[PDB]
Amino acid sequence: AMGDGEMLLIINEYGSPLGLTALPDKEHGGGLLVQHVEPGSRAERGRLRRDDRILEINGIKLIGLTESQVQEQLRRALESSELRVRVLRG
Amino acid sequence: GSGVKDGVLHL
């Protein structure tokens, strides 16, 4: 849909950080706000940037989910070989 | 996993 942001692909390395720091987006309707992306990381290579708002991970929409549900869906997604992440740019 | 610190997530 028009207005739905950009779909990014991050390759998952099992057991290794992807290089993302995020926090719940309290003020803007939900999702995760990217605070930092580590240089050279898998998240950086997948074109994640500071102030991205992550709306969806591997097809699971984050808006409307509780904070605990979002954490659970992250854990689930991190069992898979890659993360398909839909973002709105800052 | 749990890189979770007062709502902030490290992934």
mmCIF file of C-alpha atoms in Angstrom:
data_model
loop_
_atom_site.group_PDB
_atom_site.id
_atom_site.type_symbol
_atom_site.label_atom_id
_atom_site.label_comp_id
_atom_site.label_asym_id
_atom_site.label_seq_id
_atom_site.Cartn_x
_atom_site.Cartn_y
_atom_site.Cartn_z
ATOM 1 C CA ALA A 1 0.000 0.000 0.000
ATOM 2 C CA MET A 2 1.000 3.581 -0.623
ATOM 3 C CA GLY A 3 2.365 5.022 2.550
ATOM 4 C CA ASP A 4 3.415 1.701 4.064
ATOM 5 C CA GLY A 5 7.121 2.441 4.221
ATOM 6 C CA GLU A 6 10.036 0.375 3.004
ATOM 7 C CA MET A 7 10.692 -3.327 3.337
ATOM 8 C CA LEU A 8 14.234 -4.134 4.450
ATOM 9 C CA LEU A 9 16.030 -7.460 4.665
ATOM 10 C CA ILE A 10 18.454 -8.245 7.487
ATOM 11 C CA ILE A 11 20.358 -11.530 7.328
ATOM 12 C CA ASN A 12 20.249 -13.271 10.737
ATOM 13 C CA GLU A 13 23.457 -14.688 12.199
ATOM 14 C CA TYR A 14 22.420 -17.209 14.828
ATOM 15 C CA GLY A 15 23.864 -16.347 18.241
ATOM 16 C CA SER A 16 25.306 -13.021 17.141
ATOM 17 C CA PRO A 17 23.939 -9.513 17.589
ATOM 18 C CA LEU A 18 22.569 -7.889 14.425
ATOM 19 C CA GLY A 19 23.676 -4.461 15.548
ATOM 20 C CA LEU A 20 20.319 -2.760 16.430
ATOM 21 C CA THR A 21 19.279 -0.833 19.531
ATOM 22 C CA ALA A 22 15.527 -0.107 19.587
ATOM 23 C CA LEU A 23 12.898 1.033 22.001
ATOM 24 C CA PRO A 24 9.108 0.940 22.026
ATOM 25 C CA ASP A 25 7.638 3.851 20.137
ATOM 26 C CA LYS A 26 5.393 5.307 22.756
ATOM 27 C CA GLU A 27 4.556 8.621 21.220
ATOM 28 C CA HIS A 28 3.982 7.765 17.565
ATOM 29 C CA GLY A 29 1.490 4.959 17.586
ATOM 30 C CA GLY A 30 3.605 1.937 18.284
ATOM 31 C CA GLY A 31 6.261 -0.203 16.767
ATOM 32 C CA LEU A 32 9.954 0.052 17.586
ATOM 33 C CA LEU A 33 12.055 3.195 17.183
ATOM 34 C CA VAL A 34 15.631 2.524 16.066
ATOM 35 C CA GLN A 35 18.064 4.391 18.323
ATOM 36 C CA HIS A 36 21.364 3.093 17.023
ATOM 37 C CA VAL A 37 22.761 0.914 14.274
ATOM 38 C CA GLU A 38 26.299 -0.445 14.700
ATOM 39 C CA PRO A 39 28.725 0.369 11.878
ATOM 40 C CA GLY A 40 29.435 -2.586 9.621
ATOM 41 C CA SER A 41 26.676 -4.685 11.169
ATOM 42 C CA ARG A 42 24.034 -6.851 9.560
ATOM 43 C CA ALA A 43 21.399 -4.303 10.489
ATOM 44 C CA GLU A 44 23.474 -1.545 8.816
ATOM 45 C CA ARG A 45 23.956 -3.643 5.690
ATOM 46 C CA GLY A 46 20.187 -4.163 5.561
ATOM 47 C CA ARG A 47 19.833 -0.349 5.476
ATOM 48 C CA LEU A 48 18.335 0.152 8.930
ATOM 49 C CA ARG A 49 18.952 3.710 10.211
ATOM 50 C CA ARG A 50 18.572 5.703 13.403
ATOM 51 C CA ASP A 51 14.989 7.070 13.780
ATOM 52 C CA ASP A 52 13.459 4.329 11.581
ATOM 53 C CA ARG A 53 10.144 3.187 13.040
ATOM 54 C CA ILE A 54 9.825 -0.583 12.652
ATOM 55 C CA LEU A 55 6.180 -1.497 11.975
ATOM 56 C CA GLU A 56 6.320 -5.167 11.032
ATOM 57 C CA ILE A 57 8.686 -8.125 11.353
ATOM 58 C CA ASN A 58 8.385 -11.229 9.159
ATOM 59 C CA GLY A 59 4.802 -10.296 8.354
ATOM 60 C CA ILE A 60 3.703 -9.742 11.970
ATOM 61 C CA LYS A 61 2.391 -6.177 12.402
ATOM 62 C CA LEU A 62 3.671 -4.641 15.614
ATOM 63 C CA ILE A 63 1.038 -1.868 16.070
ATOM 64 C CA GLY A 64 -1.579 -2.940 18.661
ATOM 65 C CA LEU A 65 0.638 -5.583 20.241
ATOM 66 C CA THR A 66 1.588 -5.337 23.889
ATOM 67 C CA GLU A 67 5.179 -4.643 24.821
ATOM 68 C CA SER A 68 5.529 -8.308 25.856
ATOM 69 C CA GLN A 69 4.001 -9.581 22.641
ATOM 70 C CA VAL A 70 6.493 -7.514 20.593
ATOM 71 C CA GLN A 71 9.404 -9.000 22.547
ATOM 72 C CA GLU A 72 8.007 -12.490 21.945
ATOM 73 C CA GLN A 73 7.623 -11.918 18.237
ATOM 74 C CA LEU A 74 11.234 -10.650 18.081
ATOM 75 C CA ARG A 75 12.411 -13.818 19.794
ATOM 76 C CA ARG A 76 10.431 -15.886 17.322
ATOM 77 C CA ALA A 77 11.746 -13.990 14.308
ATOM 78 C CA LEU A 78 15.316 -14.446 15.579
ATOM 79 C CA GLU A 79 14.832 -18.195 15.116
ATOM 80 C CA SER A 80 14.585 -17.622 11.368
ATOM 81 C CA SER A 81 17.347 -17.164 8.764
ATOM 82 C CA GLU A 82 16.445 -13.556 7.978
ATOM 83 C CA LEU A 83 14.288 -10.683 9.138
ATOM 84 C CA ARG A 84 11.980 -8.871 6.752
ATOM 85 C CA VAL A 85 11.461 -5.528 8.480
ATOM 86 C CA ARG A 86 9.047 -2.852 7.356
ATOM 87 C CA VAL A 87 10.060 0.662 8.389
ATOM 88 C CA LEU A 88 8.987 4.299 8.145
ATOM 89 C CA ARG A 89 12.056 6.492 7.778
ATOM 90 C CA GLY A 90 12.619 9.292 10.335
ATOM 91 C CA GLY B 1 17.087 -14.122 24.126
ATOM 92 C CA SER B 2 17.054 -11.149 26.503
ATOM 93 C CA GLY B 3 19.129 -8.101 25.693
ATOM 94 C CA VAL B 4 16.230 -6.182 27.254
ATOM 95 C CA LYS B 5 16.928 -3.308 29.655
ATOM 96 C CA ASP B 6 13.971 -1.174 30.852
ATOM 97 C CA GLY B 7 12.139 -1.574 27.530
ATOM 98 C CA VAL B 8 15.227 -0.879 25.416
ATOM 99 C CA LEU B 9 16.108 -3.808 23.147
ATOM 100 C CA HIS B 10 19.539 -4.783 21.861
ATOM 101 C CA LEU B 11 19.353 -7.156 18.926
#
